[PDB]
Design a protein around this ligand. Structure first.
Ligand SMILES: [Cl-]
Ligand SMILES: [Cl-]
Ligand SMILES: [Mg+2]
Ligand SMILES: [Mg+2]
Ligand SMILES: [Mg+2]
Ligand SMILES: [Mg+2]
Ligand SMILES: [Mg+2]
Ligand SMILES: [Mg+2]
Ligand SMILES: [Mg+2]
Ligand SMILES: [Mg+2]
Ligand SMILES: [Mg+2]
Ligand code: NA
Ligand code: NA
Ligand code: NA
Ligand code: NA
Ligand code: NA
Ligand code: NA
Lengths: 95, 186, 154, 140, 160
RNA sequence: CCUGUCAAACUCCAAACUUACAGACGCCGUUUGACGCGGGGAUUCCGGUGCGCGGGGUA
RNA sequence: AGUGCAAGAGCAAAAGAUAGCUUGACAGUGUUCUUCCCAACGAGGAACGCUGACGCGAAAGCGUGGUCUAGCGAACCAAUU
RNA sequence: UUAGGCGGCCACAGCGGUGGGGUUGCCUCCCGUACCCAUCCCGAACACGGAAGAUAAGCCCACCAGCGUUCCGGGGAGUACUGGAGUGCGCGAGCCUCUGGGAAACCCGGUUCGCCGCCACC
């Protein structure tokens, strides 16, 4: 990479297909998850806050409590365990 | 509309019925919304909660089902508003609901307006709702004092159908009195 | 139920392909195993397709091979009718074989090594640089194609 | 059908597009209510670089205030065809514009469930000429 | 310079002019020849020159062959004969040349070329059954000025 | 309207494929203790080649 | 379109425009990610909390500077609170 | 739901178009400014008070496919591309065979003129 900032190489994953453009529905920005629940991590291009580092887009972690309104999701980056601060807006229940 | 790339607003935004930016701030309290809506001849008050497939209304009141308790007056004014809120609040209280946040939809937060009235009644029913007393109308205008004093400048009855001549804010007191009683059929 | 026979060595074969052959209990060239025809297994042999010879053997053939090359989970003990009878849920090789093809049991469940260590093909095989449709000995075979091979490796 | 379809005057806006006012006095007296300063946008070589700054004034009249202004304004003009909008509006003259439309126009001006007016229910130059022409003056 | 330096299609597609500057102009004089005012359907015979190998043809080459072909037709059918030939391909691919050693080797812009996939028709002529042999001879000359071997394929025309 | 072509820094589309988690089968571990944790000792940080995909370069 | 500046991306009852008011560009202390994928490593950055004190708003709520990714600096020593 | 309120999915719901529907019921338009409130000017809007009138708007109901969108058939196409294998071919560029996957455009014919949840309600 010519630079190493967080949004480097994210042109695709952090952009919306023209039609999904605009403010997102509130329903999923308010979803409540319970500790232990498996959730898929995907940043919503339309929601600025509550995001995590783009590298984790695609992960499927486990909710293990929260911080403020955001959730604390445990994931394993390669062989390393990490905890990710992320709001529901960028989460979907597995299954 | 125009092409594959065209963006169509959410249905309820097309219909200009739901302010989604507000709906979000609203849902954040995690409490039930006290939906206060108006009509030319009526005033509605619903207690809504979130649901897997849409909102759930746990308890509501309509100015039309007010008469069912004695209301013989019109149904699109302050006294009517307060009362409709109170009734809903009571049913709400019955349903097991205790707190709520005021969702006034696309209405304006004008001081003393009817939504706030709907909020006052609901509050008086024993429901906890974040509010601001000095944004509510003074007790009298709630009773309908402003209307009576308007019929005072009579010369012609303010009311077509025969419901008093100088009007009766008392009927309001009588109706509130009725609701506040613990025998009423909710 | 297909018979799997590794015909190409490990040197240079992808690790993930070698690891599969290993999960299918084959660790040496000319080693054969009996695999059920399930979705999970099909995926595996499809992946091993270029270094193996597989197909559904005829009842007789299976019997000839089980007799000649089957072994207990431990030891030399010849797996013959009498052995089969005294140690398995069947009366004789034919009984065992029929159960294998019908996929009602496996060589392990009956106390047999999952692998049939065959002998080099007498008369040689058709080459390991081409598949069956090109005259090679690699890939899927006819029940008659598989039998000729298994029988030559008897 | 006709009643909730027959034209009416929604507003008569009268403004003077000067360019830098002392003219507000006349619009107030000529109409009957206060005027409104008119700022401009973008910078212009005509020493009109200032974005937000007094440049004109206007008055939006509705109801009687509007008619009582037309019962004198209209007379001072020779209305013509081309001078008409596609929606059935028109402006003559000191500018004087007249907005014409049918009953339930509030549908598109309110806040809740607002909606644009169906073309069929929109006004027309013809229907416009008619309505007005039928009130103390001549068309083309 | 030899076409051996550019006839292969292995470098990335290099066409974005919003990022490339100093691109020489094309030497191709015209793409449509003959009676361009007429329609291709007004002709009974349609013959195309099909490239047999996927390659890159430098603009000087397209012009060199297009020229030698039309020039033949003009000579056989007159400067206004009843025919119309088309060079359907355009030289979008920009070419470089590193002209320091392999240091800072990214080359400078020196030309352009057209990428043609084998099987495609480079040239297409439309004529009357009588001039079919001239148009065939024109193509026999055109393919002698481009890298690949070609097929002079006749399409609408069962007049043999 | 018709007609002629394109894109590493275009996309109305769109694979194979790679990838997170879970289940199942397989294989493996529970005296051969896996997975994991803590500690001692390194060597190593001139690599090369084939194949696939590459970027540069006439090569 | 606009949104201070590369480029890519976000945004329409707004994240833009206008108006008004205001100083959360606040003090203290953390959790987590990043810097350094995996996989150890400082300064720096960010996300997300809590405690305290505030601003706005009817209220939910928003404000841990600028819509997001650049705008940064150890020990010793000095000055400063 | 003989016309309502709050939503979920967020065009299968968009764009355009046709027909139908409301005496004390509903939603509206509509009527009207003493008040709460309001327009940097206008009761236009916002807010309040109200029924003389109306179904022309909106809205609800029924329906049309020309455009846009969703999905499906048949064809394009098992084509293009591609994961695994080859002492197969080719000067080479590259191609081919076997095995496991598999488009896109476009054409023709269907589908789509929203679906679903909670509440209230002759
Ligand atoms: Cl993170
Ligand atoms: Cl409302
Ligand atoms: Mg990319
Ligand atoms: Mg043994
Ligand atoms: Mg021999
Ligand atoms: Mg051989
Ligand atoms: Mg990759
Ligand atoms: Mg911010
Ligand atoms: Mg020093
Ligand atoms: Mg200092
Ligand atoms: Mg109608
Ligand atoms: Na969105
Ligand atoms: Na140099
Ligand atoms: Na040639
Ligand atoms: Na740090
Ligand atoms: Na001003
Ligand atoms: Na109507």
């Amino acid at each position: 990479p010519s630079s190493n900032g967080p949004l480097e190489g994210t042109r695709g994953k952090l952009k919306n297909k023209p039609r999904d453009r605009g403010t997102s529905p509130p329903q999923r920005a308010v979803e409540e998850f319970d500790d232990g629940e498996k959730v898929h991590l995907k940043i919503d291009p339309s929601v600025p806050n509550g995001r995590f580092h783009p590298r984790f887009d695609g992960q499927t972690g486990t909710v293990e409590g929260k911080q403020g309104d955001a959730y604390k999701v445990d994931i394993v980056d390669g062989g390393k365990e990490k905890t990710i601060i992320v709001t529901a807006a960028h989460l979907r229940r597995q299954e | 509309a125009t092409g594959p790339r065209y963006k169509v607003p959410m249905r309820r935004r097309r219909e200009a019925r739901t302010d989604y930016h507000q709906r979000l701030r609203l849902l954040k309290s995690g409490k039930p919304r006290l939906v206060a809506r108006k009509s030319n001849k009526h005033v509605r008050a619903q207690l809504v909660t979130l649901g897997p497939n849409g909102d759930d209304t746990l308890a509501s009141a309509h100015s039309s089902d007010l008469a069912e308790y004695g209301w013989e007056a019109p149904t699109g004014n302050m006294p009517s508003a307060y009362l409709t809120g109170l009734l809903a609040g009571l049913r709400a209280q019955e349903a097991g609901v205790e707190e709520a946040v005021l969702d006034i939809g696309l209405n304006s937060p004008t001081p003393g307006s009817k939504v706030f009235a709907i909020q006052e009644g609901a509050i008086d029913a024993g429901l906890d709702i974040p509010h601001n007393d000095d944004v509510l109308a003074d007790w009298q205008r709630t009773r309908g004092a402003h209307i009576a004093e308007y019929d005072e400048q009579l010369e012609e009855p303010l009311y077509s159908g025969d419901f008093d001549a100088a009007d009766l804010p008392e009927h309001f007191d009588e109706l509130r009195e009725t609701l506040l009683d613990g025998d009423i059929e909710l | 139920m297909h018979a799997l026979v590794q015909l190409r060595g490990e040197v240079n074969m992808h690790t993930d392909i070698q690891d599969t052959l290993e999960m299918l209990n084959i660790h040496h060239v000319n080693h054969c195993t009996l695999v059920p025809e399930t979705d999970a297994y099909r995926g595996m042999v499809a992946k091993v397709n270029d270094f193996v010879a597989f197909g559904e053997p005829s009842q007789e053939t299976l019997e000839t091979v089980l007799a000649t090359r089957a072994e207990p989970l431990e030891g030399d003990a010849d797996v013959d009718d009498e052995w089969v009878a005294e140690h398995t849920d069947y009366d004789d090789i034919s009984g065992l074989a029929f159960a294998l093809l019908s996929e009602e049991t496996t060589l392990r469940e009956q106390g047999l090594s999952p692998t049939l260590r065959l002998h080099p093909p007498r008369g040689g095989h058709d080459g390991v640089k081409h598949p069956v449709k090109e005259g090679g000995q690699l890939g899927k075979h006819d029940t008659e194609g598989i039998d000729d091979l298994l029988e030559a490796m008897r | 059908f006709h009643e909730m379809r027959e034209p009416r005057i929604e507003k008569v806006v009268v403004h003077m597009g000067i360019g830098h006012a002392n003219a507000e006095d006349i619009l107030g007296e000529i109409t009957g209510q206060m005027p409104v300063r008119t700022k401009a946008k973008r910078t212009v070589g005509e020493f009109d670089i200032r974005e937000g700054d007094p440049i004109g004034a206007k008055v939006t009249l509705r109801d009687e205030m509007a008619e009582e202004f037309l019962q004198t304004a209209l007379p001072l003009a020779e209305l013509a065809t081309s001078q008409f909008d596609d929606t059935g509006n028109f402006s003559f003259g000191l500018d004087v514009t007249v907005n014409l439309v049918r009953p339930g126009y509030r549908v598109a001006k309110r806040d809740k469930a607002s909606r644009s007016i169906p073309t069929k229910h929109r006004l027309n130059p013809a229907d416009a000429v008619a309505f007005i022409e039928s009130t103390y003056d001549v068309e083309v | 310079k030899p076409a051996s330096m550019y006839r292969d299609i292995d470098k990335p597609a290099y066409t974005r002019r919003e990022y490339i500057t100093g691109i020489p102009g094309s030497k191709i004089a015209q793409h449509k020849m003959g009676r361009k005012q007429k329609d291709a359907d007004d002709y009974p015979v349609q013959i195309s020159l099909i490239v047999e190998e996927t390659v890159q043809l430098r603009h000087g080459s397209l012009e060199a062959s297009r020229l030698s072909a039309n020039r033949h037709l003009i000579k056989e059918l007159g400067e206004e004969g009843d025919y119309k030939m088309t060079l359907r391909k355009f030289p979008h691919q920009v070419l470089r040349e590193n002209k320091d050693g392999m240091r800072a080797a990214f080359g400078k812009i020196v030309g352009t070329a057209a990428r043609v996939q084998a099987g495609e028709q480079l040239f297409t002529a439309y004529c009357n059954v009588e001039d079919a042999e001239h148009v065939k001879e024109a193509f026999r000359r055109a393919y002698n000025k481009i890298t690949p071997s070609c097929r002079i394929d006749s399409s609408p025309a069962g007049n043999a």
